[PDB]
Structure formats: C-alpha cells, structure tokens
C-alpha cells in the first residue's frame with residue numbers, strides 16, 4: 001500500500017510498525033512529499049511499494065544492520081534493500097561490485113552468482129539507507145527532505161531492544177547514526193562507503209563481515225551466514 005494513505009500496521013512488519021510509531025506522521029508526510037514530486041514532474045526511486053521494504057523483514061530478528069546513503073540512482077537498480085539488485089541485473093552497480101570484492105577478500109567465498117542480497121535480509125541483516133528515496137541520476141537529491149528522522153527512529157528502536165546489535169555504517173550520512181548506538185548492547189563498525197569515489201579511502205580491506213561476526217560472538221549472539229549463492 002501507499003505511505004500517505006495507509007498506516008504502518010499495513011505498510012511494515014508488526015514489530016517495525018510499533019518501533020516506528022514515533023515517526024508515523026513523518027512517514028505519511030514523506031508520502032505527501034513523493035506525491036508532490038510526481039505532481040511536479042520529477043521521479044523517484046525505488047518504486048513506491050519498495051521504499052519501506054527493509055521494514056518488511058522482522059524487527060525482532062535483526063542482528064546486524066548495514067546502512068548506506070540513499071538508493072541507487074539508475075532506474076532498474078534500487079529495490080528498497082540497500083545495495084541489492086534484482087537477480088537478473090547485470091552488470092552489477094559499481095558499489096556492489098566493490099562490496100563483493102571485499103566479501104570475497106574477507107570471507108574467502110567465491111563471487112556471488114548475482115546481486116540479490118535478499119538472503120542477508122532473510123538471515124537477520126537490515127539493509128537500510130539513511131535516506132530512502134532518490135531522484136533518478138542524482139545521488140543525494142532527497143537528503144534533508146525528512147527521511148533522516150525515520151531512519152534515526154529505526155536505529156533508536158533497534159538499539160533499545162533487549163538484544164545484541166552490530167551496525168555497519170558505510171559513509172558519512174550513515175555515520176550520523178553513531179550517536180544513537182551508544183548503549184552497551186550495540187557496537188558500530190564505520191568505514192568509507194564502497195562507492196568508487198570513496199572506497200580506496202578505507203572500504204577495501206575493512207573486513208566488515210568477519211568483524212561483525214566476531215562482535216556478535218563476543219556478545220553471545222549467532223553470527224550471520226553471509227554466504228550468497
């Protein structure tokens with residue numbers, strides 16, 4: 001359903017609907033923002049029904065969150081899960097090829113068959129962006145338009161759960177969530193973003209997957225099975 005018209009209880013998974021209650025009005029306001037963009041003749045990505053897709057996997061099952069900046073800017077790439085693409089997309093976006101190069105260097109696994117990250121989402125990884133929409137061809141075009149309050153609320157709610165959490169924060173916009181992760185059940189890994197523009201400043205060699213698993217094991221949580229087909 002549409003974010004302007006329908007309540008969180010309809011839009012997102014039950015635990016997420018309770019977690020996001022402080023931003024219920026703000027999510028409806030974003031639906032009105034997106035409506036105004038279409039009225040004005042501007043486009044947005046991902047598709048309306050995918051914008052909140054990260055919050056359709058169970059809140060109670062999240063062990064790791066990965067946070068990027070904003071969705072892929074090329075039509076046909078963004079699917080509402082950060083960095084993921086549909087299984088028939090080729091070539092992979094360059095950021096995703098960089099992620100997979102680090103995945104193979106860190107974990108020793110072969111390169112994945114395709115760019116679909118839904119196994120991670122189905123295994124306790126929240127695939128979040130700091131901002132949940134973008135105008136085509138214009139990275140960061142929806143920065144400061146109201147999504148930040150929504151993703152801040154999501155992180156605060158996860159951090160408050162009586163459960164371990166590991167956050168992987170890629171880039172500067174994602175790292176504005178670090179203050180909200182201060183509680184002792186939460187630990188944050190931060191690096192430069194995997195974009196070609198920033199990856200060589202510290203994404204490559206950062207070993208985020210193995211490190212997140214070492215942190216989860218030190219907190220007595222089950223490691224993520226990162227292996228993609």
Ligand SMILES: O=C1CC(=O)NC(=O)N1
Nearest residue numbers: 068069070071072082083
């Ligand atoms: O281009 C992209 C895709 C994504 O989902 N997240 C990012 O930060 N960058």
Ligand SMILES: [Cl-]
Nearest residue numbers: 041042043136
């Ligand atoms: Cl447009």
Ligand SMILES: [Cl-]
Nearest residue numbers: 171172173193
């Ligand atoms: Cl950045």
